Amino acid sequence: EIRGVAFKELFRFADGLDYVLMGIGSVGAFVHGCSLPLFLRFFADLVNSFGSNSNNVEKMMEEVLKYALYFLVVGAAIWASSWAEISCWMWSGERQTTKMRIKYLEAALNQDIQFFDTEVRTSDVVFAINTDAVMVQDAISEKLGNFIHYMATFVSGFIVGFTAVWQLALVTLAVVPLIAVIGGIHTTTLSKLSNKSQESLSQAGNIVEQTVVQIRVVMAFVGESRASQAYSSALKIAQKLGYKTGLAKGMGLGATYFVVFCCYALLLWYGGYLVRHHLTNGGLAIATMFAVMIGGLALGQSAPSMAAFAKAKVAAAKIFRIIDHKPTIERNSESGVELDSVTGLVELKNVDFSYPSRPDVKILNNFCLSVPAGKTIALVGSSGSGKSTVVSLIERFYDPNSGQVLLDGQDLKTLKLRWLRQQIGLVSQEPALFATSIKENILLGRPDADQVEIEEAARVANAHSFIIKLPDGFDTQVGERGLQLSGGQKQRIAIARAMLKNPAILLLDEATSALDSESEKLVQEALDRFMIGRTTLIIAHRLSTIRKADLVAVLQQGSVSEIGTHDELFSKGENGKLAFKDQANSFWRLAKMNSPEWKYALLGSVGSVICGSLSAFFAYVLSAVLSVYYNPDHEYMIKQIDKYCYLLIGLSSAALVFNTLQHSFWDIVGENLTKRVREKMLSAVLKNEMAWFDQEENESARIAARLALDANNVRSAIGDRISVIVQNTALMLVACTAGFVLQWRLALVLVAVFPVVVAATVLQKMFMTGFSGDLEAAHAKGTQLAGEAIANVRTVAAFNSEAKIVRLYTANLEPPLKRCFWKGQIAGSGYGVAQFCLYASYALGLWYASWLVKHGISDFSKTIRVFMVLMVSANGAAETLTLAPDFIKGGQAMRSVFELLDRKTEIEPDDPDTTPVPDRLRGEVELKHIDFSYPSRPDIQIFRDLSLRARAGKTLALVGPSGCGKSSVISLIQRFYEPSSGRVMIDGKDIRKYNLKAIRKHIAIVPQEPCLFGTTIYENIAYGHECATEAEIIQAATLASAHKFISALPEGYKTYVGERGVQLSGGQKQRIAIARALVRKAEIMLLDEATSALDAESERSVQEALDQACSGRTSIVVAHRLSTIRNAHVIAVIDDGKVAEQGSHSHLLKNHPDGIYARMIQLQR
DSSP: OOOOOOGGGGGTTOOHHHHHHHHHHHHHHHHHHHHHHHHHHHHHHHHHHHHTTSSOHHHHHHHHHHHHHHHHHHHHHHHHHHHHHHHHHHHHHHHHHHHHHHHHHHHHHTSOHHHHHHTSOHHHHHHHHHHIIIIIHHIIIIIHHHHHHHHHHHHHHHHHHHHHOHHHHHHHHHHHHHHHHHHHHHHHHHHHHHHHHHHHHHHHHHHHHHHHHTHHHHHHTTOHHHHHHHHHHHHHHHHHHHHHHHHHHHHHHHHHHHHHHHHHHHHHHHHHHHHHTTSOOHHHHHHHHHHHHHHHHHHHHHHHHHHHHHHHHHHHHHHHHHHHOOOSGGGSOSSOBOOOSOOSOOEEOSOOOOOTTSOSSOSSOOOOOOOOTTOOBOOOOTTSHHHHHHHHHHTTOOOSSSSOEEETTEETTTBOHHHHGGGOOOOOSSOOOOSSBHHHHHHTTOTTOOHHHHHHHHHTTTSSTTTTTSTTGGGOBSSSSSOOOTTSSHHHHHHHHHHHSOOSSOEEOOOOOSSOHHHHHHHHHHHTSSSSOOEEOOSSOTTTHHHHSSOOOOOGGGSOSOOSOSOSOOOOOOOOOOOOHHHHHHHHHHHHHTGGGHHHHHHHHHHHHHHHHHHHHHHHHHHHHHHHHSOSOHHHHHHHHHHHHHHHHHHHHHHHHHHHHHHHHHHHHHHHHHHHHHHHHHHHHHSSOHHHHHSGGGOHHHHHHHHHHHHHHHHHHHHHHHHHHHHHHHHHHHHHHHHHHHHHHHHHHHHHTHHHHHHHHHHHHHHHHOSOOOHHHHTHHHHHHHHHHHHTHHHHHHTTOHHHHHHHHHHHHHHHHHHHHHHHHHHHHHHHHHHHHHHHHHHHHHHHHHHHHHTTSSOHHHHHHHHHHHHHHHHHHHHHHHHHHHHHHHHHHHHHHHHHHTOOOSSOSSOSSOOOOOSSOOOOEEEETEEEOOTTSTTSOEEEEEOOEEOTTOEEOOOOOTTSSTHHHHHHHTTSSOOSSOEEOBTTBOSTTSOHHHHHTTEEEOOSSOOOOSSOHHHHHHTTSTTOOHHHHHHHHHHTTOHHHHHHSSSGGGOOOSSSSOOOOHHHHHHHHHHHHHHHTOSEEEOOOOOSSOOHHHHHHHHHHHHHHHTTSOEEOOOOOOSOOSOOSOOOOOBTTBOOOOOOTTOSSSSSTTTTTTHHHHHHO
8 A cells, every 4th residue: 555645745735825825934934943043143132232331321221222223123024024934834725625526526526336346335435534644634734844944943053053152052952862861751751651651541441331321230230339349450450551651751851850950050160161261141041041942842842743754744645545546337439429308118137236245156146127108117136135236237337247227228338327317216224314404405306496396395295284384494504403313204394395496317225114104104205196107116125116117127146037917926024701609619628528638739739839939940040040140250150150050950959859749749749639530420310210310411432431521621721731830839929029129020920921921831831732623523523424415325316416516625625714814813913912022021131230220239240049939930820720621611510520429319219218138028019000101211101000019929921012011011120110190009019118138138130132241151140149159150050051061161150251251152142141130039029021032942941940930939030922921820921001801821812812922833843
């Protein structure tokens, strides 16, 4: 396969406007990248002129004013360059990708069906839209501009550093690889540990998934405690892994800080050494160190652009592979012929289109069909693939295999696709309603129709019926809340679309089987009763569709063995603003929940504070050193520099230790809180109603994802941001007090421009993250429309709707293009304004410091210290501000957690106070006056005053009709559900006022669906009893005859079983389930359908096991088997929920057995 395409080939769809936009964006990116080292050079010059002219205040003032004006110029240039790069790059990328998406969809729809059958799957073609949006759109829009900007930053920083002071720049260049290596090691270790932790969390989520999808048996066998214990053990494993991750992260940050501080101490000492020997000044030294570091960071940030370039190269190679392919059918004569005035007597004398995915096997053998002109024909046979193949051959899907197919004596090779498709009124299995308005779907047959023609076409489907009462009539769309059901109007919509097309030769297909007779009867009256009936083949439900048809044309082995009259029968055997007060209260409650860990957090908090202070100290030291750089006394400079270097090394050691401490303790408390919350949520979920589990929102996958997502958000957001906000608040406080006590005038002035600085820095962080949001979410409508069109390429090609589909695609993609353009313009303008205001604030601060020094109010050293410390504090505040959205997300996640946890249950399985349980039960049960609503579908009500009797020690074999009630009765006696007015009357007492756990301790359940747990069958049998020994398991296996096959298995009781397991036979796993029921050893055992699909030996063995199990004491069995139910005291058949005669199998009186218990016995024998 192709491993990529040339990078320049990614710009295939770029026009002159795209080229000029890319040029402007490149220039803007280059200037914006080069600006920052230029600002560093200007800052160095300003500091040199401000510190070297203490004797002459005048010249100092003019130089400071000049360099403040230079700062303003740099800010304006940054504004212009950032605006240009962001807007131009974003818009050009969007334009190119939209053009390529349109071309890709057009090419895909222009391909043949065999292309999707053999070369590329349809799912891959649909996924290509999203993979394009993710890689190709993103690399050429933002990643390329970022790459240019970071290359410019790196080159300009290196040039500035090596032109200012080449020796110190060389030393910093040697330093940079140390930080790079430390960061790389930290990232690799953290990624590996996080991968392991994610695997452990996935195992825990799998445990939740398996215990929620199969709650029927978990609740019945009071296994919630075992599930909670297993989940707790998995969470302990994940918690140890999380502790290791936190320790590794703390160690990495500590090592980074230690290396940075030690290397900066060395660099400051060497810069001092240069200053004494008059090779430079302090400002140049600081500037060159910072510039070389900025260049290294620029390379580091530019690497991801290269990664995105590689990904987009691969994706664009795939996209161009799909686009550049040429269709095979289109290679014929584009002129063709149009015979016109079709009669409809086409003759398919031999078949073709052998599904080239499987050319060795020929699915359809050559046969003659010869549909008569103006006469209906219907053919049934094979397994539905033959009829579909005949339809495909009729719709010019020809691939030369055998003979030819002709229309009215004209072979289709001379015919044209654009005309032949117009003559075919296809109706398929799926109506294939595209995401658009109803009037567009109906008009899709031919765009040259009007409203009146659409009205007449829909008139056949009972005028409008459901359509007229729709919110917007024909203009409503199917994407939003419309009908959203297969048994809806969409089939009639497809029928109307066919009617709006030419009523020539047409290919009917089997319609829906749900809803009522109106839809199908409309199908015949619009497709068979309009005269000139065509080939209306029926794949399934041939009870009356083919009986009404005049021809049968049976299709054994892909050939017409018999054709003609329809009277003769055959061997058919088919079935037939958000609130914040409550949010803060919720944080208070959550912090109360994890109270035992406060000390941990508290200790970590202390470390956090210290860490913040350390940062401030570093800043101070730098400024202090800068001041010492501008001191005529050389020896005093030596002493001060040595003192500051030693203090910096001490700060490095302290930073390592306390960063490790802070991160480790905060992650420890976060993981403990997360585990406690997860356990609480699982305990709350398992203690709920079965009707609660029946809801779609509480589906197994949904609950698993909710548990895996909400807890992770509550962990990460809360822990990370609480640590960050504590350390940054400490940094802010110490910085503010230091700046004030040094020079409160300058400190106050800088605090005035504090919001401007924090806004500019948060915009800088957003720019580094990316100014384009979710790209796939922008084109969601277009993507889903394209996916629907491609998945139904047969329908699109049948109606010649490729042009209409691509036009709708362009119409859907234009608003995202305009929105992207405006978003890019707004983002560029805002970012540029923020940067300009930031540099204006810097210039104003320096000018005010110079003015204060000029008037004798302060000195150079105090002012420079205040400035640097305050700027560092502002940067920390900006970091907190940009981490705040994670706080918002964690708050909403924890709100969801608490709303789930505080949910109250109408039934509680563990009632603290109730009448005591008897050790031995009598077993009698009454179901007097049962009225069960079944709240899953309240529109359907069952058990019309149902009444059930079962006294001690006899098997109750009520069966009823299949598909009505059945297992629901069992669901009542476990009290999974609650009858509206029913009375459960077991053992002369009421369950609804009784403890559920005590009863479930005494009842056995074997549902018709097999139940499998874990990986070993041993615990599958053992699940019945909490403390079942080996002897009990052996005995229960012998009673159920389960020992023989499980001994035949190699691993035996420890055989790998489950969804990924051996996937053994249904009978064996049913034996396992009944063995588990015997292990429970319940005084009351309840059975279910036991004869779904088994062979003779397995059927006999499981029946013997059932007879052995029911013997001994009271049991209820339903099943569906004919007779030989052994214990046949009374057998009841439900009639739409009402109570009917409980005719026994002895046939005492022939009223009930002759009524319902007669036909099914003869049919099943």
